[PDB]
RNA sequence: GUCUACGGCCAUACCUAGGCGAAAACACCAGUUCCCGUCCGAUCACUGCAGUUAAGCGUCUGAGGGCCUCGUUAGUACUAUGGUUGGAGACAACAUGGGAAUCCGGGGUGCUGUAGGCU
RNA sequence: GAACAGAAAUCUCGAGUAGAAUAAAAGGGUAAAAGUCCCCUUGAUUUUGAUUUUCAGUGUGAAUACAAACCAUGAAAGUGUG
RNA sequence: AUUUCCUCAACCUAUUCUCAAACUUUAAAUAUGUAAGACGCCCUUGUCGCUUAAUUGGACGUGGGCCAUCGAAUGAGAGUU
RNA sequence: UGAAAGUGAAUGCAGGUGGGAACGCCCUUGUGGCGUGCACCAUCGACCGACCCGGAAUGGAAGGGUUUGAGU
């Protein structure tokens, strides 16, 4: 039940499976992509231990 | 009842093999160009080939 | 004249509001075929005021019009034409002048000399068999009507005889007959040398002498006779050819600039606007 | 209830703008078009000749041909599972240059202006555009700018 | 200065309103009175209640200017005893009237040709109205240079020793 | 519940709305009096028919006149039936009013002495209308756009000119001379 | 600077009323033989400079009308996305985002290219 | 305003952003015109390929920009393949 | 009474209540077209029967210099039969 | 190739241009530069037939053409 734009964005993020995780460099282009997939992902600032 | 049109699956079908783009070639046929331009380009190109041939040969 | 009438009003183009530019004709006059790219179309702009004749050779660009060459009938006395500076013959002379000025600028004056001694015969400057084609220009009559014998075609005749290639038919020259579709070179030669003006005065010497004195007052006070007119025009055309260059004037513009600022009104500010608004309300006795 | 005439459903698409009727500005005819130019298509309803179909209104393509009063423009249109090369003959009243094309031209020019200067000074050039970075650290002062404490406001009818 | 009112054009129209032998003899008398060719006004539209012939000549009129226009106006006033009323003068500065039995004017007459009525309408213009009439650079005349009814009445009373009704 | 379908050249064959009179009481009143206004506002998007409005106006006119007279109220009906509801005959059937949330249905300006009376009459009309409505007291003077405190200051300065029921409010726009003559008591202060 | 010819954008340029405009230019303006066209040299055509800034034209002023522009209106209206949110429903609130119009107020009332003239 | 006698038939002067006209529907377009009048005309012609729309990117219809001719019109730039 | 009175209608003006899928000066969100150089950037010179007043231009070329953020992000081997 | 009567395939290295397999050479450690360039595709020409041209009894040779063919 993933609509086409969000499905494509998660593919571009290499987030293809539930509970998968990636590091992303935060810029305006990345931020607007994460806005479209807000219901389908969660993200935040990781510390050094993480 | 007949006449049952819908576009529901048609967009999905188009994207299975994607929206293909045509191959882009270096040269397009001059048959799309103005005939007067095309006729003169034949003579211009013929002279360029002759001049390129002579300069290589005389070198 | 309600506000909705004004609100919805669309102004014509500025040069259409002041009745100067025919944009229908201007588009067809200057619009080059796109596969000729940046080759300019040249117009022979010919305009008449009440006293003088303006001849210009103009091309068009996106940002405005560019004058290749100009000739003004006010410069004719320098070549010896001091009277009738707005007539058919003056139109002819100022057309020949801009033709010689334009050809020098494009470096074709020696190759295309036009007619040295016009005899009023319809002809176009033919292209040299092996050499540059003649400089081509199109007539821009403006808002003047193109009736037979109009002065715009006199200036076009002069420019054509000056070596410029101007496409034209002789259907609007003075003396052309529409019944037989033939051009009488005699009347056309007459107009080129100002004989039509010569015949007017000679008629006026015979009858209504007081009308003659009132009409050609400029020509009388120089003691010019109708026989002289052909000679002055014929000599002026020759002087134009030998030296066509436009002598740039040396009048001091700074004096004109300084003079015109003194008579130039200034615009008020808000601080003064508040001052007069209070004063008028005070003088109204309602504050 | 569906006609397929050429200009069906173009009631607003082919309207001149409000207080923009009448004369066509003559700079449209003095623009120069060359093969390889990127042009925008925008139909002028006042020029019925050389009109492109409404599909091409608002589309951008490359000039492939130049005639006396018109340009041929290459446009790709989706017709199924692929794009199709369309060759539209448009009178130049319905065409204008893409403003980005001069922007791409100037950016490249500034790239080579930077690259040559950086080379002579013996330094890097850094010609790559970047997305808007995260905002940097600053030090907002409060002198003469003390915080104002807000509260949510009580409800009250304003009619 | 150049604020001198003068006659621009005098229009004279037949008021008979008939087509036939009377209409033709109207052209002859219009030609005689003016020295000019009497162009024929047409019927713009046929009417059911009158049956006016479409695109057929019904009325004839001429436009007269120049010094002979003043003479025609002068002989019109003489037969009018130089007496016109206030309401004749139009809001734009024109005035006109209408007189029957054009026999009273100074043209020889016979009882064979017929009796015809002949009107007057004088258009008034200061010099400089060419601005609004020329083809090129056609401007609009200023407010102060336009002609009002009061101005053309005073012009009428300044000469011709005329008087106007005090309604 | 489709898109608005009013009378038009495409919808010429229409019935007339059952309500034609929208103004009541002292319609030709002034600005000094009737200073207090009560509104009946629609709390939800309803489709009040012209029959329901016509019923309400008849009920409001009778009760208000009996209880206070004719010179102490300016009842008016804000909602207008312009949407056409269709039916299949035993084609257009009737006229209804599409009113959004917070649309005033009937507005009555009365004296402050009739504040309680105006509330009660506007309260009774809820039983005639469908949906839910609320009674509120306007913060504006009658049928104006200004607050009571502001209107008092405009009235005390002398910048208000009574024109029938409504009035003219001075503005900083237009020729001064006309503004000066029209407002005699007002002081065009020079700043 | 002003003016004239040809323009570009086509009202911060239009419409209105009233003040000013030295020089030149432009204009109004003086005629009808020739060219030319009209019921009419009004217009259009020619041929001129005796007269006039009065009209055009230019510039300045209106707590002018319109027009342009910036703010208020207003993150209000609307809207992409979200919930096993509320509510019988109508709709509403909230969440991650996008974001007007209109009115009202202040300011403004042509800029500019080429060529040539001008105490 | 003038006639005639209601008739704004006609004629004249002002204002007039198109509120008229443009064959037939509606929408779009158009003001020194695309409307009205006038003058001359047959580009409503012969030939070739390219293109757009409907679309399978087949046919048919309709349409666009050119080319080789031959012409019309205009002083001319141009415009004209209904 | 071709001198007036008002309820009579008509029109003009400024306010005023309320609307539009086949109204509109404005005008979103979402959706949508194109571009983000190596077929790229600067000069020397060649061709032509096209085009220009003209080696003028246009089109196609030749020879040299810019190959180190090769010119937003992210991802990914791709396309034709 | 043309309905047919008929006519019938090299200007050139059996042509030019772009990409390109494989190979060779130079760098200098790069996704290199340089030179040939198979297959294939796009493209500018040439050649044969048809058709449309002018075109100096029978033949159609040189010159052409926006075209046309399931050709070379
Ligand atoms: Mg939602
Ligand atoms: Mg869900």
CSV table of C-alpha atoms (C1' of nucleotides) in Angstrom, one decimal, chain E residues 15 44-45 87-88 90 92 94 96-98 119-121 123 140, chain H residues 1-5 7-16 32:
chain,number,residue,atom,x,y,z
E,15,UNK,CA,-37.4,68.9,-46.2
E,44,UNK,CA,-30.8,53.6,-44.7
E,45,UNK,CA,-33.6,51.1,-44.0
E,87,UNK,CA,-33.0,76.9,-28.4
E,88,UNK,CA,-31.9,76.8,-32.1
E,90,UNK,CA,-26.8,73.5,-30.2
E,92,UNK,CA,-21.6,72.2,-29.3
E,94,UNK,CA,-23.9,74.9,-34.0
E,96,UNK,CA,-29.7,76.0,-37.8
E,97,UNK,CA,-33.3,76.5,-38.7
E,98,UNK,CA,-35.8,75.8,-41.5
E,119,UNK,CA,-33.3,74.4,-44.5
E,120,UNK,CA,-30.1,75.7,-42.9
E,121,UNK,CA,-27.5,74.2,-40.6
E,123,UNK,CA,-21.4,74.5,-38.4
E,140,UNK,CA,-8.4,66.4,-29.5
H,1,G,C1',-29.6,71.0,-32.6
H,2,A,C1',-32.3,71.3,-37.8
H,3,A,C1',-36.0,69.6,-40.0
H,4,C,C1',-40.6,67.3,-41.5
H,5,A,C1',-44.1,65.9,-37.7
H,7,A,C1',-40.2,59.5,-36.8
H,8,A,C1',-35.1,60.9,-33.7
H,9,A,C1',-37.0,58.5,-41.0
H,10,U,C1',-33.2,62.0,-42.6
H,11,C,C1',-29.3,65.5,-41.8
H,12,U,C1',-25.2,68.1,-38.3
H,13,C,C1',-22.0,68.4,-34.3
H,14,G,C1',-19.9,66.1,-29.6
H,15,A,C1',-19.0,61.6,-26.3
H,16,G,C1',-18.3,56.8,-27.3
H,32,A,C1',-5.7,53.8,-39.3
